[PDB]
Amino acid sequence: NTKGIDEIKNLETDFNGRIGVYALDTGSGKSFSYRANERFPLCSSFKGFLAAAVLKGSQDNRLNLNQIVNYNTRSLEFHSPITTKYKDNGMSLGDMAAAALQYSDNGATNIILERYIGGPEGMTKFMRSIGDEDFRLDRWELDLNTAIPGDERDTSTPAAVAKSLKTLALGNILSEHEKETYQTWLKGNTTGAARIRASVPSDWVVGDKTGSCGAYGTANDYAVVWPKNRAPLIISVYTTKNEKEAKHEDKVIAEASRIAIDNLK
Numbered sequence: 001n002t003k004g005i006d007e008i009k010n011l012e013t014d015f016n017g018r019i020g021v022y023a024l025d026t027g028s029g030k031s032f033s034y035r036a037n038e039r040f041p042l043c044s045s046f047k048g049f050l051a052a053a054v055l056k057g058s059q060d061n062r063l064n065l066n067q068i069v070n071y072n073t074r075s076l077e078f079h080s081p082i083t084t085k086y087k088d089n090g091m092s093l094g095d096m097a098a099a100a101l102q103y104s105d106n107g108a109t110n111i112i113l114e115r116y117i118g119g120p121e122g123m124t125k126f127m128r129s130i131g132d133e134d135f136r137l138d139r140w141e142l143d144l145n146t147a148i149p150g151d152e153r154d155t156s157t158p159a160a161v162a163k164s165l166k167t168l169a170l171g172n173i174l175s176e177h178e179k180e181t182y183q184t185w186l187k188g189n190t191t192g193a194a195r196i197r198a199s200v201p202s203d204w205v206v207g208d209k210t211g212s213c214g215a216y217g218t219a220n221d222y223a224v225v226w227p228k229n230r231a232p233l234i235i236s237v238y239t240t241k242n243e244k245e246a247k248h249e250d251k252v253i254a255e256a257s258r259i260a261i262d263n264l265k
Contacts, residue, residue, distance in 0.1 A: 004263030027231025040238035048209030065094030080107030134160035217241035219248030
């Protein structure tokens with residue numbers, strides 16, 4: 001069989017779940033896919049796209065990243081490490097968007113969705129505008145994390161996530177300046193050490209956004225990877241299981257990424 005497919009099938013069997021992967025070498029055009037067209041829960045991974053929406057809004061001069069966002073009278077959501085620190089004085093819109101991505105800050109995520117993006121509908125509309133027909137955000141944090149098998153709410157496909165990431169980080173939707181900011185934010189992510197970052201050599205640079213639902217062993221990660229002296233790669237790995245109480249496996253995500261990188265054709 002084609003290189004890497006049997007290896008990922010065996011990984012999936014041992015994991016006793018479902019693994020979706022899409023990888024693309026932007027230099028040669030070679031790719032690797034496995035269940036790339038199947039739906040998987042997004043979990044926090046959509047926050048990486050939320051940040052890009054804010055950058056697009058700044059670029060259109062509809063928003064200003066320097067605008068101070070005040071929320072001193074708003075109860076903050078579970079897991080709001082950055083927004084809790086600056087609740088008294090407030091935070092600039094740019095810093096809030098960065099926190100939503102880099103720390104998966106829920107307060108930052110919901111505040112931005114409520115005030116600037118137009119909620120789940122607005123987030124979905126933004127993705128449709130960049131050519132993404134699969135992405136769908138239906139709920140807010142933290143309800144969107146249920147990850148119920150068969151449920152199409154708050155899901156997308158590994159292929160759609162990869163295409164949207166390539167379009168936003170390396171395409172022409174965002175200007176040269178906004179792309180640099182977006183790439184900097186991705187590189188500064190603090191939650192992906194054990195996933196895609198663990199599958200590549202020490203001298204390769206990685207920009208990513210993780211997602212962990214906390215249910216049905218559902219976890220994921222997508223990234224722009226800049227290999228030493230090579231054009232960037234786009235990697236998207238999504239996983240889920242049928243047991244409600246099953247824990248996610250970071251090592252499975254890392255291994256699926258390693259297999260994809262070594263089998264680009």
